[PDB]
Amino acid sequence: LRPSSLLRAYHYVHPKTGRPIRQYRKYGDPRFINNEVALIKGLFALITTDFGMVTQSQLENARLAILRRMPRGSFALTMHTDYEEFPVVQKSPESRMGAGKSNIHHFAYKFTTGVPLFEITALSSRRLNQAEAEGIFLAGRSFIPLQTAVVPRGRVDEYHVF
Amino acid sequence: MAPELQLEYIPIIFTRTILGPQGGFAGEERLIKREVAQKYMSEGNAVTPSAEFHQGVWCYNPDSEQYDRFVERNAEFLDFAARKRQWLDVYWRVNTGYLLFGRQSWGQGWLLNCPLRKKDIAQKLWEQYKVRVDPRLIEFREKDRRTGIQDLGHNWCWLYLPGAEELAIDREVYDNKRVKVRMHIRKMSSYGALY
Amino acid sequence: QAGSPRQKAKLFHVIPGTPVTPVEKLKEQRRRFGQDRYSRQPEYRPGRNVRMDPNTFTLYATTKGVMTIRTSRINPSYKWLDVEPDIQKVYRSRCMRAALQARGKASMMVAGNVHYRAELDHVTEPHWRERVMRVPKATERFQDPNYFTRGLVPSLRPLSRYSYE
Amino acid sequence: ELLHPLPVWARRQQWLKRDTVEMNEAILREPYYRIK
Amino acid sequence: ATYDPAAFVSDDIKKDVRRPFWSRRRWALSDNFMVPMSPKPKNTIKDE
Amino acid sequence: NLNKRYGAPYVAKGYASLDPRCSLDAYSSFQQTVTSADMKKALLSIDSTSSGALVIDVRSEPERRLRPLLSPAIVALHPHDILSGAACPILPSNKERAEMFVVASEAQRAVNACTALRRWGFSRVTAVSVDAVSEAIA
Amino acid sequence: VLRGNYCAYLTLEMCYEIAKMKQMSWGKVEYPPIEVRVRRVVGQARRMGIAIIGIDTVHSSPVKGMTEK
Amino acid sequence: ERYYALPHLRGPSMPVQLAQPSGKYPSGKFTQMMEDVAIHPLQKPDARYKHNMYPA
Amino acid sequence: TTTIAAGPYRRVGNVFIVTCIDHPFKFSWEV
Amino acid sequence: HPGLVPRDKLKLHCEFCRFHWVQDTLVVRCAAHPKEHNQREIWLEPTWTWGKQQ
RNA sequence: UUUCUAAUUUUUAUAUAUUGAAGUAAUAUGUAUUGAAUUGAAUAUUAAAAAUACAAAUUUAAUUUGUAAUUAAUAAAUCU
Ligand SMILES: [Zn+2]
């Protein structure tokens, strides 16, 4: 069938076979507008105001850039990863040289609107400003392929971020 | 009761105060889905309506983080858990819903040729979700305050749910005074499109 | 990898609500042999005067009469097919129910109303959730066999334990 | 194909359309009669 | 017990103000750090 | 680019010109009272040689058989002939000077029918007394 | 926050004498009144880790004279 | 058919002690006088080095 | 005259005059 | 002079870095670091036409 | 598309500036502390101490000097 016996929601694994489930292309389509806002608990978080498909390598290159522009001892970046992953070039004639093994391996997320990505969470009484915050994320936002805006602590008040 | 035929939803007295649509709040009786409710009676957020709980129940305060707050359900609270439910039923209905359209769009700018009216959102609220409101509360975005909605694809616009202060309703909904109704304008030829 | 056959159409061969002869297949159900294994549960279980064919799970009525689907009050996914034998009993009411509601004199809280059944049961039996949710102790489910010989209980039924309402 | 924009006069004479329909359905919600 | 839509519901056609370049400081505060809209490629929204 | 061709009473219009406020004022008139003198003034409107019945009863047809009040020739309107607007062809011209009344079985329907009137541009009606107009037999 | 430990103690009785040789207007020895001058040297101390006793601690300087009351 | 509709008001429409914080960093228009601020010309503030050093 | 008119009440129906403003061949088979 | 792709990216790096209307294009011109910190908004060439650059 | 005629859908639709705000003054916990060859608001990290307002810079091997001192500048008023 289709999703069950998940591997902790990263990707679904076939019930009668440990193979990955190999879903449809437009499964889990991000082209909703997510109704549920995110209750971020970091001081600032980077939510995705639009939708798209973002790799893990695009999200890891962004962390390596956010982790440069951030004061070390004070704030510890927090990157969320519980979201579900999705496959790539999977099909057989649709792969190159019958190497379906080396094309599906990439795992990209289908982010809807308003999913938090990172967190400049605090480890002290040190504080942040939106100017002090957007300045950090302005490095990584140039890698995350979709549009994203930073949001302050607590419930994103999506009346304003949009 | 049978393993085949199970109640699709069951009655529930909430002890805690869950945010989600299936959620409730302190002490109201709600028929929430079975699978969800069954991981509440284990979780402790809910308890099946025994005759005892129908008078009082020890609800929860995040202040001391334990089931101390006794919320007695006299006929007065049962006039409070109604207006507070009837309110956040309009909330969780428009916020969960994704109201569709079919419109005509000759031209290139992907522009709906007869753009939308705040009449034409309360009309697709009452049509699809039966949510009956005043179209004087629907505030549009800044891009569509001038020309109406006017563009295909996903538009959203804010619906103002005014009367939520004597219900003591905050932190159990995303925004006390608004809600994002989420349009979508699926262009269609004269066959299925109106206006 | 392989091929596949086309999924046949397993749908109604009458109009629900309208009269019905016995030689009509009321519904040709998927004997949902998941893939030709031997265990399935049909969508529309048989009802009054309707008898299910064992092999292909197709419901054939047993007596000519008007037909209807009774969605279970507990779970609206599990339906029966009722055939009530008297065709005049419903026609001579429909012709009224649809003549009254034309003059605006019929009430919409009728049991047969589709959207009211959720509330209808609750006006009469207010705790029916608890009457089906109640779990029975294995003592009362097998009432004292001596009460059967002493004749107190008319006849012990130990397997009929599930409330199908 | 839909290449150049709908001329403005057309959009305007199509805003008269929805304001025709918005004037039909004002007729199709009148009472069936009038107590006179 | 009256709610007037008009108090809180404001539908104002606001002029999107230019980032004032004629003054130096108000050009720097106005620098809304979302000018990295350059990631607006209409990229593949359901594939990679 | 609407609101340039059409007014502001376009797109910013809550076309629900039916009942954003009147329903409230309906429950206002419900509160105060209606009594003998409040019918005795209407009695003078029956004393007025010009006979247009003042009060109207929106009650089920079996109810009125039980307590017939039709004596002063008052109007018996089904509460939908009021709501639907089928009654405007028999309704006073002076929308600002006329105050009819509305009798009803239980006072929820009365106010629920008088709000329909105030939706039809009517200004004064205190909207109920099932028992007074019988105690004021006239 | 750089070092993890309060360094050498002090007591307000001592800052009042560091504050006596530190007068901004050495023409007007007390332009800032002395008590106002101390909160300055106290803050500069705390900013160096100098936890003084009268504050920063649960108990003030214990005395063999009398009850805490 | 169910129709969902708001309850009748018993208290103030816009919440006051229930208001969610605004949601945008509340750097007021007066701490960084970015725009929308109007001041009398007699009462011009904060020119401590330009034209408040010689106040009138 | 400030009075709900009093008299034996006749009710009168309505008669719609319908015209066709859009071509029929653009629309569905039900319309 | 690196065309700062939108107008909004323009930033005055130096004290002598100011704005200028170089033929309808808002640009940044600095006497110091003359081309090192110079920025020019993206816009049509100063002398375009209606058939060549739309 | 019988023929003469009449007609309500038109290779005509509105494009972002006014203002290189650059004079107006010695100082004073203080060159904090730490890490540092050195660092004095502008190395590195560290940032909720204060009082008698000006610690996210340029500058210098360091400082001082020297730039800088949170302001009027309403395109909205459709143009037909
Ligand atoms: Zn420069």
Coordinates of C-alpha atoms and ligand atoms in Angstrom, one line a residue, chain J residues 12-17 30 32-33 36-38, ligand 1:
Chain J
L12 CA 26.5 53.0 1.7
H13 CA 29.7 51.1 2.9
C14 CA 31.9 54.3 3.3
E15 CA 31.4 57.8 4.7
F16 CA 32.0 59.2 1.2
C17 CA 29.6 56.6 -0.4
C30 CA 32.2 57.3 -3.8
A32 CA 37.2 57.2 -2.1
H33 CA 37.6 53.5 -3.2
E36 CA 35.8 49.4 -5.2
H37 CA 32.5 50.3 -3.3
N38 CA 30.5 51.7 -6.3
Ligands
ZN1 ZN 33.0 53.1 0.3

